Design an enzyme around this catalytic site. Structure first.
Site, short mmCIF file in Angstrom:
data_model
loop_
_atom_site.label_atom_id
_atom_site.label_comp_id
_atom_site.label_asym_id
_atom_site.label_seq_id
_atom_site.Cartn_x
_atom_site.Cartn_y
_atom_site.Cartn_z
N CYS A 1 -6.69 7.90 7.23
CA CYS A 1 -5.45 7.14 7.47
C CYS A 1 -4.68 7.75 8.65
CB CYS A 1 -4.61 7.16 6.21
SG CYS A 1 -3.04 6.31 6.40
N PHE B 1 -6.21 9.56 1.44
CA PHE B 1 -6.08 9.03 2.82
C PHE B 1 -7.45 8.87 3.47
CE2 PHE B 1 -1.86 10.86 2.02
CZ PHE B 1 -1.11 9.73 2.23
N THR C 1 0.86 -1.21 0.00
CA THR C 1 0.00 0.00 0.00
C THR C 1 0.89 1.25 0.00
OG1 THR C 1 -1.87 -1.17 0.97
CG2 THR C 1 -1.87 1.22 1.16
#
Ligand SMILES: CC(C)C1=CC2=CC[C@@H]3[C@](C)(CCC[C@@]3(C)C(=O)N[C@@H](Cc3c[nH]c4ccccc34)C(=O)O)[C@H]2CC1
Length: 455
Positions: free
Chosen positions: A400, A393, A268
């Site tokens: 995130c 994000f 990722t």
């Protein structure tokens, strides 16, 4: 004025389900969004979701008073080994808010000063590897970026060295983690998963979960036994108390947080570096500008924390790679109450939305006609970007937690790469995006010619 939602082609009683019988489902959904526009219904036996692609609708989906994070089936399958860690927990689960409150200060921009020296340790290993290649040799870009990002989260996270630069074969934990992630993603398009034909898959899944739990539980037990204060995420999780409940995390939840961090810090995160280097070699004027900044700012053998913060154009390169190929390319929401999306689409409490991030990031009403062009300068004036246009994000309190960590790592190593080497796209690489948990440029290779600048 209440409008009828578009829907892609159907397959009788299977409805839209066969459209995701593909090795590139995100790219398939992006082509459907190109055809159908900002919203489409996707039906399968026993489920419906709505894929959103416009800033106009996604700005409303990002209203936390109306929509909360949903666990996609993808996240539910990953929860079999990431448990109630931050990534795979519902907002309403006690362990979500407890871990959020405990961990947020460990992930702040200020916290990055503390991780910097460890990040430099792994970045210097990558630079040395490339300095030590012989003339006739190339770099396997996603492979080396994954060595870097995995090792960085292991060292900064848990003071554990995966020693990825000393290996061809993944570390055994990583073999099990990758196979468990593959099995989780494969189950998304597995009709008849209880067919005894899948007995060996299920046995292997359980074995892989055991490998992960055994190493992580042992690291936690070893740290508790030693009493060592190593100032890492594990130290922070053993010592920390949630100000709200006044409780610490239990050892089981700490294990799930570590597994979660190792998943996120693998492909990722390395995908961002892989796509960034892809776009730089395909856009030589942008590479030259980034390399000029790296040479001007990185005046010491080892980059300092403040010098990484100075790499403003490198930051814009990373944001422009996240715009075109965000490596966690979708997230799921549910309606908290009955509501109307965009004055046009009535939703009932519980109704699910998917945010298709790469398609959001191609909204010409936001970015203009040149949306497919790699132009980092489009991030020069970020106050001009409308709300919720740029979401690599995710959103709000479920965004995130790793954003500052990922961007610091990525900015440090991309800066060092641009300072130390000239790059050649020696194969004229044709972008091929492999979809797993994440996106990567499969088979992306380059040659690096040392500028012969000492470390
Ligand atoms: C673990 C994290 C990092 C991930 C999150 C994801 C979210 C959306 C996913 C994903 C990109 C994988 C491909 C399917 C897709 C696009 C999806 O819509 N999936 C929906 C719809 C769906 C597809 N197949 C299904 C089978 C059953 C139920 C739902 C579905 C879902 O998962 O819910 C996937 C990548 C991995």
């Amino acid at each position: 004025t209440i409008k009828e939602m578009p829907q892609p082609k159907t397959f009788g009683e299977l409805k839209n389900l066969p459209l995701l019988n593909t090795d590139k489902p995100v790219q398939a959904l992006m082509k459907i969004a190109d055809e159908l526009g900002e919203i489409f219904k996707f039906e399968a036996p026993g489920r419906v979701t709505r894929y959103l692609s416009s800033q106009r609708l996604i700005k409303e989906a990002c209203d936390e008073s109306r929509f909360d994070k949903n666990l996609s089936q993808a996240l539910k399958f990953v929860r079999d080994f990431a448990g109630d860690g931050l990534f795979t927990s519902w907002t309403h689960e006690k362990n979500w808010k407890k871990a959020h409150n405990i961990l947020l200060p460990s992930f702040s921009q200020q916290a990055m000063k503390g991780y910097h020296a460890m990040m430099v340790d792994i970045a210097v290993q990558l630079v040395q590897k490339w300095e030590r290649l012989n003339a006739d040799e190339h770099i396997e870009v996603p492979e080396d970026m994954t060595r870097l990002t995995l090792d960085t989260i292991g060292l900064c996270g848990f003071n554990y060295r995966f020693n990825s630069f000393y290996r061809d074969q993944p570390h055994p934990f990583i073999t099990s983690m990758v196979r468990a992630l593959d099995e989780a993603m494969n189950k998304l398009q597995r009709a008849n998963p209880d067919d005894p034909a899948y007995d060996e898959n299920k046995r292997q899944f359980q074995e892989d979960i055991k490998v992960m739990n055994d190493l992580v539980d042992k690291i936690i037990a070893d740290r508790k036994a030693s009493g060592e204060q190593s100032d890492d995420l594990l130290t922070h999780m053993l010592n920390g108390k949630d100000p709200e409940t006044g409780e610490p995390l239990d050892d089981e939840n700490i294990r799930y947080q570590i597994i979660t961090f190792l998943i996120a810090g693998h492909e990722t995160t390395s995908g961002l570096l892989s796509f960034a280097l892809y776009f730089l070699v395909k856009n030589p004027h942008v590479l030259q500008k980034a390399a000029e900044e790296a040479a001007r700012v990185l005046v010491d053998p080892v980059p300092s924390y403040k010098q990484v913060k100075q790499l403003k154009y490198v930051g814009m390169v990373l944001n422009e790679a996240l715009r075109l190929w965000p490596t966690a390319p979708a997230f799921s929401l549910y309606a908290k109450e009955d509501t109307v999306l965009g004055g046009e689409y009535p939703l009932e409490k519980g109704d699910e939305l998917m945010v298709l991030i790469p398609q959001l990031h191609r909204d010409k009403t936001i970015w203009g006609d040149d949306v497919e062009e790699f132009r980092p300068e489009r991030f020069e004036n970020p106050s001009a970007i409308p709300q919720h246009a740029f979401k690599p994000f995710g959103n709000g309190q479920r965004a995130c937690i790793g954003q500052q960590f990922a961007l610091h790592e990525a900015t440090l190593v991309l800066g060092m790469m641009l300072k130390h080497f000239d790059f050649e796209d020696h194969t004229n690489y044709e972008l091929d995006i492999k979809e797993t948990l994440t996106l990567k440029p499969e088979g992306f290779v380059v040659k690096a010619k040392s500028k012969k600048i000492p470390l």
